[PDB]
Amino acid sequence: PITFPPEVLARISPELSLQRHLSLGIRPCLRKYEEFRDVAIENNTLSRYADAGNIDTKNNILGSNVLKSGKTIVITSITGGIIEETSEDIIANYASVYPVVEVERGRVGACTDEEMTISQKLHDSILHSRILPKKALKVKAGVRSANEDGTFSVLYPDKRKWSYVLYAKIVVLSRTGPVFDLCWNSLMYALQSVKLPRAFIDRETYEIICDQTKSVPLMINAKNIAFASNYGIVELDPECQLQNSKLNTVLIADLDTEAEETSIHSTISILAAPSGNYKQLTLMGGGAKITPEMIKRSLLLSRVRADDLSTRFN
Amino acid sequence: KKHNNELLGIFVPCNLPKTTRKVAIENFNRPSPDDIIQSAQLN
Amino acid sequence: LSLQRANVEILAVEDKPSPIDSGIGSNGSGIVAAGGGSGAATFSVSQASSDLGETFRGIIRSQDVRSTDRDRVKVIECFKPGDIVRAQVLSLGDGTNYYLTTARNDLGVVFARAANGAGGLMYATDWQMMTSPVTGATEKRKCAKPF
Amino acid sequence: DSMSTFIFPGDSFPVDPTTPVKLGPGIYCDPNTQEIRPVNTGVLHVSAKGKVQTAYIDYSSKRYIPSVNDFVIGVIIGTFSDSYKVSLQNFSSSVSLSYMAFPNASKKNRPTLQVGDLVYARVCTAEKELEAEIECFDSTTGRDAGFGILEDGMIIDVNLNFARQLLFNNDFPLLKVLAAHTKFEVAIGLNGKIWVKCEELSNTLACYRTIMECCQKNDTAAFKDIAKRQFKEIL
Amino acid sequence: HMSLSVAEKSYLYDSLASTPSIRPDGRLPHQFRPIEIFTDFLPSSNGSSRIIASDGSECIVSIKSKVVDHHVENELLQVDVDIAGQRDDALVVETITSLLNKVLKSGSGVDSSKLQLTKKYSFKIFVDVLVISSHSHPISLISFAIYSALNSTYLPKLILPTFHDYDMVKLDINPPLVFILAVVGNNMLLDPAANESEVANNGLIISWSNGKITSPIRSVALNDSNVKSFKPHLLKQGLAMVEKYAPDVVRSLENL
Amino acid sequence: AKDIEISASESKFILEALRQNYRLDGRSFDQFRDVEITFGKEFGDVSVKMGNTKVHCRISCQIAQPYEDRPFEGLFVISTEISPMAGSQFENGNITGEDEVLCSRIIEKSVRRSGALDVEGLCIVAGSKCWAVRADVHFLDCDGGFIDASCIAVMAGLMHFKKPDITVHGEQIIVHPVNEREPVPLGILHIPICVTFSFFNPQDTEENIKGETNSEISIIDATLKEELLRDGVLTVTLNKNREVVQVSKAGGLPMDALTLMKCCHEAYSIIEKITDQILQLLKEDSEKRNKYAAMLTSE
Amino acid sequence: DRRRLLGPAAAKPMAFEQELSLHTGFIENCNGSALVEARSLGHQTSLITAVYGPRSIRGSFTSQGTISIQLKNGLLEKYNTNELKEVSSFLMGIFNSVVNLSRYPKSGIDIFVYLTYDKDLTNSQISSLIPHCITSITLALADAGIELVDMAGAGEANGTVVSFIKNGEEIVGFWKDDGDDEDLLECLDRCKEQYNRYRDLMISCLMNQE
Amino acid sequence: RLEIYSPEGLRLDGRRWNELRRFESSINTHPHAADGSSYMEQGNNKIITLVKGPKEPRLKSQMDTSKALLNVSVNITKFSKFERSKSSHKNERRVLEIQTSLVRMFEKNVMLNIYPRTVIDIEIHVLEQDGGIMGSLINGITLALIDAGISMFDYISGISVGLYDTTPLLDTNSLEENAMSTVTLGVVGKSEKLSLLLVEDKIPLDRLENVLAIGIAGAHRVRDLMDEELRKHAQKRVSNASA
Amino acid sequence: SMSVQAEIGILDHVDGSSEFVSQDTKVICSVTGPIEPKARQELPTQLALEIIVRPAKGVATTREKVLEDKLRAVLTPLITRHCYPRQLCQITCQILESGEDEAEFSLRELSCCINAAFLALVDAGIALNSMCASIPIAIIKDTSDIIVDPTAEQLKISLSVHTLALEFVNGGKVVKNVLLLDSNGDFNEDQLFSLLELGEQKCQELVTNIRRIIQDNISPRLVV
Ligand code: NA
Ligand code: NA
Ligand code: NA
């Protein structure tokens, strides 16, 4: 009786592996249909403001997050810069971060389609979910006036304009499936931990420089913070069903384990807020027919997942 | 968990009746064409 | 597939998948080969061995398909594109290809789909024949002996 | 049946279920659902009968796909040990032309075709798993079947429909309106290639120009006029 | 040279590991191959050197200068290496670049004070290396060329800084030398040939300045085929060998 | 590989046709193709059609910071990235390719460096702001003459383009939508036009290098079929000030100097027509826009 | 950059003895993996290695294995690219001495070292970081099932990194970059003690874990 | 502004309108690095040209069954100018244009068809630069290719001519190249036929022909020089090799 | 209410080509295939897709990469890929005019890209499983109305934006599947399903119109 390990079976016949597992009410990732992977978070451990008592001088990380789901790890770090500005709920008044996603797989070289699309979609979804107002990125410049004559002190208000620019570096270790959701959630927690450094100043122009210790809260709209979910729609093939000693379709949550990623072509992805509103929805009917029922169950599961991810910490 | 072992093998159709399975096993118990020609050439 | 040989890609060596990461999802949302995306155009040959989903490549020559009747073997009746074939390594070959053989009872097609990968899975019925459960139609392969 | 009907991919197939129907281009038999479904946009074409009717969809295409018994015009792009590497169309997968695949051909007597030569051949093998194969002889008897080298002519790129219409439809006036002006040799390749050679370069050029202009125009009756204006030898 | 057969490698290794070692050209373990050097041929530059080895390895070094504020530019000496047939991205090129930058670090590679003009300004030294040809590790080759170039380098003379229009002062400094050694069995070899480097068990990069064995010191695989471990006494042997046979390289290079 | 396979009969046919003073599309050797310039929608959007050759250009601008080296000059870049849309022989974005680098360099030398655009007129304030004008060429269909078509497209676009009026109060600037204030055109100093000559060697190389009676054939604005078979290529950019804006004979079949001069002069004869055509079509566009406004103010 | 979101160009960046934990096989999409965390007084480090291989190589047939080593900056861009590539080359030499390359013709082994965390509260740190790199790479290679003639170990003292095999009898690596001038012997002894401890810990980790 | 051309008819360097800079060449200067080689000095331009081949193609791509592959690598060192360039030039579009220009120049001169399935790599190092560098590159390539024994139809002589107001100046240096438009010429042998014709800045059409007239002549002189070296180097190394 | 302009077979050196225009959004697409793929693109049992999207202004970025990704998600199940094993289909879209504020939105461009790609695939003669139609839909800030084919102005004040690409069979009367639904902004379930019903109707309208446009210029090419 010839036999293949689950790994190499997932390599050889992903569809058959998926169907066979689903015939037993389980998945090749050893979770049942609507069972998410648990998540664990280490928040603000890499930031320079990690320790208020002993602030790291060399560090330039404004925000930090370390997420772990299943066996996949995501490390997100928020750095910053300043741009000189020139010259409602509408989208014009909102901002976004500029993320660089680095999914650690065997290769070395320029960005893959995965990394590029995940980065861009992170940016765009941050913009459209309206989590970060442009107003919150405005810098209130203090001025460095000289102590008597002999050194220098800075005065902040309790004359050009300026704006904060946030950058995100997101590295993904031990990828086993689609990692956009993990990146989004990690970036959310990371954004919640960001502290904006205070800034001061002295055809010719003087540079603006950030204060070493002082920092103000990055005030984001907590109302609009959503969390990410993904789902697969699988059509059961009668021949590949196990004996377990007329067509059916099942909904699957939190895809993983290659067999699922290779076989499933009908996918749903949601950014859902704890309040009840939805920030993003993506339907791709590459395989099985996407019915309204599936959409509704997906929205339900996305919202409970959102409540879960927003409540489980603090 | 996962004691069936029917999932980690070659595709065998769920539909298939036992008799035809016996037919297949029978066919594979008989010598392969390689075996026939080989034994013929050896004799 | 060609009249002279069958080109294959090694997916696993001794119950061990190679490579460990096939590169699924690397190239986007469609159905894309390991190097059919943006990453393949910008790969650093200088700093890495091979790209993400790159596999060891192999060749099963028509002569090395069978033990007997090696002179007149039709590879089109033995394998089809997409088939999963259990083979044994004859030689290291060159940098591009290993040289493989199926000239044994336990070697050959272990998985196959009707209509050249388009249809449903077929099961091995006889040494040189598989059949589809839903259609009933038979297709000609060189089947590796199960059990 | 006899009435040809316009059809889109995904539309319901309108032929008689109880009547056996051999399926040509445009019609796809789904490997999983076993459903008969149209996959090309164009005109649905049902032949009378015989023994079974042919259902096919004539659709506008520019890209040739090798099928057996097709007469094609290729260009030699490579020489191998026992075969030629041939191109039936730029950017397309090449086709093999055996060295044995010639009249009076043995291992001692080889064909004299070089890279860059035009070959007029017949698609003898077009398996979906293998590289296509062409031939320059009658596979049965082994003698010349009107195939072989095409020398010193001019080649014309054309859509598949035009070429098929040119080879099969005898009511097509282009050849007739061309014959009205000059004597010419023509080779028609279903791969969308038309070879033309006249005794005088001027006349061959005229043929080229008028054939291409006729190809770009959908109206058939215009041809004569075009030919006239083209054989008036304007610049 | 490179890509020797297993038979050739075995022969060469057996000769090089025997006691005493038999080198393919009959050199003593401490003997260098004939080279010749030319200087002062690039007028546009402050210094210039060209070194040619007997095996064909040829290198060119240019010395240029520019005024910089120490405070904004703490590094007053920068080495840029360009090897022909190798991209600037290449591992070996960046390795050699880093190494050379460390041998010549203004910190203690050379005397920084010799560069100072004013308490706010100085000359930054740009050392540009162009390896035309190399059949072995070119680190010593480059090092020697740089030594020669620096020992024949002239800079504009100070009188915001203004400079003399026609008169220039010779840059006085003791440039360091980097030596490369081949570890073959229990034998240490100086100036390893390509074939010697193909079978060497390992290698030793040893810097040298003012008559002292200075840093950087590296162990370096001269190949990937026969890289083996070595005993510490060999390292000691290499160091002793350098500090014994270095002053003669110094007096040979500094006699003009 | 993606190579265009050309047969011996085709090469010999076209070459022999050139020997008998014949071109496939019925043009004389010195006959440039009828240029069809079509404007549409916003300013700086132009489509150029030479026979079957089809290109499209889109002019745009955004506020930026002047380069540190040049304090008074604005920013101007031109992009000519080929795509498989023009033909499968083109790889997607091979900017390091021979013909790609050549094309880009010719256009850049013709427009960006010739001072065809007033870069100092782009400057808003010397220290902190300037206009960043961009010219993006889109190659839609390739039947040869891409350099010339690109030059015409870029120029017509630049002349058609209008940046929004703005004014400045020290640190701050005030930018206007069309309703606030009318847009103003860019500063065009001259109109560079490129003409591409293709050279064919009817005899053997020996006759070209060491033979008298030069039989080297020259034609203007070659088609794709002609471009694929040519042995040499010259691109000459001129303006109506009888200035040789630039000349590029980057190798290829050696040609007699006098012939090249003749080429330059005939090219001038062509760029006169093309320039007058561009100006005319521009003014007609503006007039039709005005008359449309007049039709809009009163029903 | 056309392949990244770097944001506005006008913007400018914001300016303003030791315990060991060793684990293996926690990264699922590679062959081998190792987590090494080190804690000394007022100094904490932590890094991860991943061995992808044996994989296929582009190019001509190679008679033996080809090892690549890639150092990746973690969090802070702490080190120079040139120095990273130099250290990479050093490690390449070491594990070219250690790995049984004969077993892997026409094959490449790619090793990645992520320098996630390196915060030392004390107020050229490459030297002190190299031995942990070597530890992690040896662990990950053993975890990947990549054959090793020995367990490559190392130690650091006075800017002198020394990497040993065979119970410290012989040297596979020697790195000396300034870091003051002291005699060689005691640096050898200290680095050898570090090596022996690291070796014991690594075998221990390979016996509780694999 | 300064007397580029004095009423006396002299230039800043002291040359007249129709005089070449100092032109010296050396052949077989790197016998252990390349099949052919040349070191060349034109004015202050100092260039090393290395020709490797014909040889086996590195890849089993880039192999042509009908002709040899010709590659040209131009290395403009950071120390070629007075002010060191902090940036490499290797991937600049200017350098790529120069490379492709030289390649397409010598594709029609070198008999590639008699070296099929081979690759000819040309490796150039510009050690020092002082204007008119294109013609210098051309000359270096010609010399090195001839030294390699690689067959070609004729010499190709490179020269530059500036246009100051009405008068053309032969073989321009760096100062002359600035504040003046220059034409670069690649002339085949002693013929009037041009391999290369490069004009990168605006020039009055009616005065272009004249600029070519002297240019060609100058190029001819350059040929006579290169030739003069080769023969000597030939005459020397064909007599000493005897007995 | 919704009227579109569309043309077919406008490019000479490709197998198929199309021009799609909706409001101010103007996109031209080309298709070449089935042709020989390069080894890295090749798939054993099915057609491989090379998909390219070029912006109207500037040069291709990650934005266009996402556009290519979604376009691929739409076109992959559309094409009968198993008819062309080990072959390539080259699909290139050149956005001529965005018809929307590029920095904030790209849904118009995406929809027109899908429509144009479909039309070009039809013109090329490539086997398609079924028909397809895509529309952009917006929900406004104050009115909270659902606008099909929203203008750039309407987009500026939109509360949410949506791309709806549906797959049609049987004369365009039956919805086989939803190929793509890309929803971004703030919305709820009720709004979603209202948007889906209206969207489906309008998309059916678009399918009908597209059928007519296709037959209008394909029919004269063919023989009775
Ligand atoms: Na290897
Ligand atoms: Na000459
Ligand atoms: Na003269």
Curated annotation (Swiss-Prot), chain A:
Recorded hits in InterPro entries, A to Z, give: ExoRNase_PH_dom1, Exosome_comp_Rrp42_subfam, PNPase/RNase_PH_dom_sf, Ribosomal_Su5_D2-typ_SF
The reported effect of I208T is: Interaction with RRP46 abolished
Its predominant location is cytoplasm
- Tell me where it resides: Cytoplasm; Nucleus, Nucleolus
Q: List the disulfide bonds.
A: none
Q: Which CDD domains match?
A: RNase_PH
Q: Tell me which residues bear Phosphoserine.
A: S13
Gene3D superfamilies cross-referenced by the UniProt entry: GHMP Kinase, N-terminal domain
Q: Record's SUPFAM superfamilies?
A: Ribosomal protein S5 domain 2-like
A GO molecular-function annotation? mRNA 3'-UTR AU-rich region binding
Name one cellular component (GO) term.
nucleus
Biological process per Gene Ontology, one example term: rRNA catabolic process
Q: What is the effect of changing A199T?
A: Interaction with RRP46 abolished
**Known Pfam families for this protein?**
RNase_PH
Keywords attached to this Swiss-Prot or TrEMBL record, sorted alphabetically, are: Acetylation, Cytoplasm, Exosome, Nucleus, Phosphoprotein, RNA-binding, rRNA processing
- What family is this? Belongs to the RNase PH family.
Main role? Non-catalytic component of the RNA exosome complex which has 3'->5' exoribonuclease activity and participates in a multitude of cellular RNA processing and degradation events. In the nucleus, the RNA exosome complex is involved in proper maturation of stable RNA species such as rRNA, snRNA and snoRNA, in the elimination of RNA processing by-products and non-coding 'pervasive' transcripts, such as antisense RNA species and cryptic unstable transcripts (CUTs), and of mRNAs with processing defects, thereby limiting or excluding their export to the cytoplasm.
Miscellaneous note of the record: Present with 3180 molecules/cell in log phase SD medium.
Tell me which PANTHER family the record gives: EXOSOME COMPLEX COMPONENT RRP43, EXOSOME COMPLEX EXONUCLEASE RIBOSOMAL RNA PROCESSING PROTEIN
Protein name per UniProt: Exosome complex component RRP43
Curated annotation (Swiss-Prot), chain C:
Is Nucleotidyltransferase among this UniProt entry's keywords? no
Subcellular location(s): the record lists: Cytoplasm; Nucleus, Nucleolus
Q: Could you tell me the Gene Ontology terms of the biological process aspect for this record? A: exonucleolytic trimming to generate mature 3'-end of 5.8S rRNA from tricistronic rRNA transcript (SSU-rRNA, 5.8S rRNA, LSU-rRNA); mRNA processing; nuclear polyadenylation-dependent rRNA catabolic process; nuclear-transcribed mRNA catabolic process; nuclear-transcribed mRNA catabolic process, non-stop decay; RNA catabolic process; RNA processing; TRAMP-dependent tRNA surveillance pathway
Q: Record's GO cellular component, any one?
A: cytoplasm
Q: Give this protein's Gene Ontology molecular function annotations.
A: RNA binding
UniProt entry tagged with the keyword tRNA processing: no
The cysteines joined by S-S bonds are none
In terms of superkingdom, the source organism counts as Eukaryota
Q: Which UniProt keywords apply?
A: Cytoplasm, Exosome, Nucleus, Phosphoprotein, RNA-binding, rRNA processing
According to its UniProt entry, what is the function of this protein?
Non-catalytic component of the RNA exosome complex which has 3'->5' exoribonuclease activity and participates in a multitude of cellular RNA processing and degradation events. In the nucleus, the RNA exosome complex is involved in proper maturation of stable RNA species such as rRNA, snRNA and snoRNA, in the elimination of RNA processing by-products and non-coding 'pervasive' transcripts, such as antisense RNA species and cryptic unstable transcripts (CUTs), and of mRNAs with processing defects, thereby limiting or excluding their export to the cytoplasm.
Q: What else is known?
A: Present with 5550 molecules/cell in log phase SD medium.
The record's comment on protein family reads: Belongs to the CSL4 family.
Q: What is this protein called?
A: Exosome complex component CSL4
Curated annotation (Swiss-Prot), chain H:
* GO terms, biological process: exonucleolytic trimming to generate mature 3'-end of 5.8S rRNA from tricistronic rRNA transcript (SSU-rRNA, 5.8S rRNA, LSU-rRNA); nuclear mRNA surveillance; nuclear polyadenylation-dependent CUT catabolic process; nuclear-transcribed mRNA catabolic process; nuclear-transcribed mRNA catabolic process, 3'-5' exonucleolytic nonsense-mediated decay; poly(A)-dependent snoRNA 3'-end processing; RNA catabolic process; RNA processing
Q: Which domain of life is it from?
A: Eukaryota
GO CC terms of this entry: cytoplasmic exosome (RNase complex); exosome (RNase complex); nuclear exosome (RNase complex); nucleolus; nucleus
Pfam families from the UniProt entry: RNase_PH (PF01138), RNase_PH_C (PF03725)
Q: Which residues form a coiled coil?
A: none
Annotated membrane-spanning segments are: none
Matching SUPFAM superfamilies: Ribonuclease PH domain 2-like, Ribosomal protein S5 domain 2-like
Keyword Membrane: yes or no? no
Q: Which UniProt keywords apply?
A: Cytoplasm, Exosome, Nucleus, RNA-binding, rRNA processing
- The set of disulfide-linked cysteines is none
Which cellular compartments is it found in? Cytoplasm; Nucleus, Nucleolus
Q: In the UniProt record, does the keyword Calcium occur?
A: no
Q: A GO molecular function for this record?
A: RNA binding
- Major subcellular location class: cytoplasm
Q: How does it assemble?
A: Component of the RNA exosome complex. Specifically part of the catalytically inactive RNA exosome core complex (Exo-9) which may associate with the catalytic subunits RRP6 and DIS3 in cytoplasmic- and nuclear-specific RNA exosome complex forms. Exo-9 is formed by a hexameric base ring of RNase PH domain-containing subunits and a cap ring consisting of CSL4, RRP4 and RRP40.
- Miscellaneous field: Present with 5150 molecules/cell in log phase SD medium.
Q: Which family does it belong to?
A: Belongs to the RNase PH family.
**Gene of this entry:** SKI6
UniProtKB/Swiss-Prot annotation, chain I:
Q: Where in the cell is it found?
A: Cytoplasm; Nucleus, Nucleolus
Q: List the Gene3D superfamilies.
A: GHMP Kinase, N-terminal domain
Q: Which InterPro entries match?
A: ExoRNase_PH_dom1 (IPR001247), ExoRNase_PH_dom2 (IPR015847), ExoRNase_PH_dom2_sf (IPR036345), PNPase/RNase_PH_dom_sf (IPR027408), Ribosomal_Su5_D2-typ_SF (IPR020568), RNase_PH (IPR050080)
Asked if the keyword Cytoplasm belongs to this entry, the reply reads yes
Signal sequence region: none
Major localization listed first in the record, in broad terms: cytoplasm
Q: Which domain of life is it from?
A: Eukaryota
Cellular compartments per GO CC: cytoplasmic exosome (RNase complex); exosome (RNase complex); nuclear exosome (RNase complex); nucleolus; nucleus
Biological processes annotated in GO: exonucleolytic trimming to generate mature 3'-end of 5.8S rRNA from tricistronic rRNA transcript (SSU-rRNA, 5.8S rRNA, LSU-rRNA); nuclear mRNA surveillance; nuclear polyadenylation-dependent mRNA catabolic process; nuclear polyadenylation-dependent rRNA catabolic process; poly(A)-dependent snoRNA 3'-end processing; RNA catabolic process; RNA processing; rRNA catabolic process
User: SUPFAM superfamilies in the record, alphabetically?
Assistant: Ribonuclease PH domain 2-like, Ribosomal protein S5 domain 2-like
UniProt KW keywords? Cytoplasm, Exosome, Nucleus, RNA-binding, rRNA processing
User: For this protein, what is any one GO molecular function term?
Assistant: RNA binding
Q: What else is known?
A: Present with 10800 molecules/cell in log phase SD medium.
The family line of this record is: Belongs to the RNase PH family.
Official protein name in the record: Exosome complex component RRP46
Q: Which gene encodes it?
A: RRP46
